[PDB]
């Protein structure tokens, strides 16, 4: 099964294993039973070359897992700037909401990835997006005490 | 004798939604002490894959004055049987409703995917619950609280390594 | 079956000395599972400089020593009225079956990595307040005029670098096992 | 009884971490009904872990057993220090349960028990110990069961120390 | 007893709960059986507004637990500078000595809180006070290797 | 003898000359081939390293794996000890049983001032190991900007 191998190679950060498998007709849109696709795996582990090979082979750039989480949520939450940029170039959705209303900007703010926060805002990220508890990225900057963050949010 | 979930249960407990995880828990009675081994694997929901800013989960198992599960609410009684007060945590040592008593807690690190770079703390609390008003009381309880505050494990599946502990038995 | 447990009871009165007489409750339960003892232990200070933790105190220890029949050496450091077989007198069981195996954990001048079991426990059962517990089996070797012992179990708590002043030294519970002498 | 299967409390060098008989593994399995209670430590006696040399930051030992729970030959654990206490009982009663820890599922979380142990018994010198149950992969003689120990202290520079660990206790579900 | 609830709210940093409780008649000078008072709890966890509420309500700024430890020892040791300033403003004894002769200056020095060492010295902290081994805050600086502190104390 | 080995490890700068005064042998070794100078170089006790060398400790003593005190000092980041070893004529290019050199260890563990000193003192940038890796393969390996730069 080429899908399982492609999921595993993207997760392991095996750049070439990925290229070999794509070469051999592996489906860039395979998914595991949680709905993670190879591009979620590559975005989460932070392997830029793998992210690019997948998007060139038609990987659904806003694929959602079973909780609504997209590859751009993962790269913004875990701090992978250059992956965040490439994803955006391919149509990544800055305002995607996961199952409790959380957005890539909310995660990048929560974990303190400020350059990512700037990049998302310049691409139209909605600052007033609230999770299902009513909390926005500005409420995060107050709760987590991040002054640079609160400043950036205006 | 052994009281357990079997070695490989089907989804049998609720961390956030019905049957959203498999808890493998084995209690073997060694006279005055229970020897136990535990692990958990989320199968659906917000811990499979870990999503948003979720950094904790918990499960509280309650038992009545005869050591029998209070109901099918939180751990499924079909995966819970002998292979029961003799397996309950000793109330003199772990006094009911006093889970904030240091000695009623056993705390240790377990590891996501069995990977030593992905720690998760597991706090087990014995008899830590207090029920009031109309709430049916439990006589005994065993709580598991997993916490990985400050670690960003989004996209991982919440699946832990296995861990052993023991505690004094009520009888 | 009560002869297969040697313990402080599940809820002892002040029964051991960390710095002053009866200044702590040590809960320690040894259950004999054939060739291994399965143990659970915790400690709570009740008065003195660990209740509350004061000054720069960052460690405590207790050494329990036993004679050649596995009987506590004296009512020095752990109180013999909270140390006995479950529901038992001294003639209900054999305490050498609970002692740390001397061939695994020798009585000698040397230091032995395998005679230690080391792990973190937590003050108030709180994961953010770790304290290291080093358990050492038979790690004493009495010389000069010190009264000799045949076996020992020592508990050394150390939280170097953490400032827990104003906390009560009260630990979570911890399980370990070791090879029995008989 | 026939309820202990062990290396004895004090084995001679009995295992290979990198070269023949370069370490002493002390490993005691005591059957407590459906669970095995175990205690393990290891000490290197020669070679690149005594003293620790170069950039060595890990060691491992895999013990494989056949369908009757008997140690495979050509095992990196010497069968002379591996036997019931004195007597021969049933080794399958000591094997890790294949429903709980399926064969070659070594990367499954639940088939691993992971905790820190300490070089020389010294709290400032942690080493991670990962125990994997039934994780082996032969495609070699086939094994039916295995118990692996992987020590890893990545990022710690312990050059010049002797690899000798504190003792550690764990348990697992027995096959029968 | 309101006292126990006050001791618990101070320790859990329940700013609001503490005000409700003071509103309702909670005794600011309640103590547990180790001699800890709510002001000890608040100085230790670091909650300034609770320290102020209690002091406005008559909390004894010089209360000692059974080891002779005062709230100023706790704030100076644990590094809470604004609490150390407020306790001193209400008349905290700068050189209070615990059961083994330890002062707030000695603990602030041992745990390397240099700003607090400087505030204590301006209120008359005594560099000569020795621990049970005969060592002063200065000897401890020398030991610890803290050169900045050794110059402040010399 | 063994007293010396123990005092050098334990850092008892005092004991060491106490023991030297009595003719304790600066080149004593335990059964792993470790000398007092290996213990002192490893724990970083400069004074002890100097007393031993002044008393004719062998600067190039190897343990059973070919590790010399200079490997230990370079690997563990003891700059002054690396300087005093080289002054006493430690082999800057010593290879252990797998070909690893002091420069290789200093690089691996990111001790850049020591990497600079070893180079000045003629450490071969090109010594390889097991995989045939060298200090340079380590730099772009461990993703180390400044070390890539210093290897010039």
UniProtKB/Swiss-Prot annotation, chain B:
Induction: Expressed in the late phase of the viral replicative cycle.
Subcellular location(s) per record: Virion; Host nucleus
GO BP annotations, alphabetical order: adhesion receptor-mediated virion attachment to host cell; cell adhesion; symbiont entry into host cell
Disulfide bonds: none
GO cellular component: host cell nucleus; viral capsid, fiber
Subunit structure of this chain's protein: Homotrimer; arranged in a triple beta-spiral. Interacts with host receptor CXADR. Interacts (via N-terminal tail region) with pentons.
Known role: Forms spikes that protrude from each vertex of the icosahedral capsid. Interacts with host coxsackievirus and adenovirus receptor CXADR located at the cell tight junctions to provide virion initial attachment to target cell. The fiber protein binds to CXADR with a higher affinity than CXADR binds to itself, thereby blocking the cell-cell adhesion function of CXADR dimers and leading to local disruption of the tight junction. Fiber protein present on neo-synthesized particles may thus disrupt the junctional integrity in order to facilitate further neighboring cells infection.
Family per record: Belongs to the adenoviridae fiber family.
Name of the protein: Fiber protein
UniProt organism field: Human adenovirus C serotype 5
Positions spanned in the full protein: 399 to 581 of 581
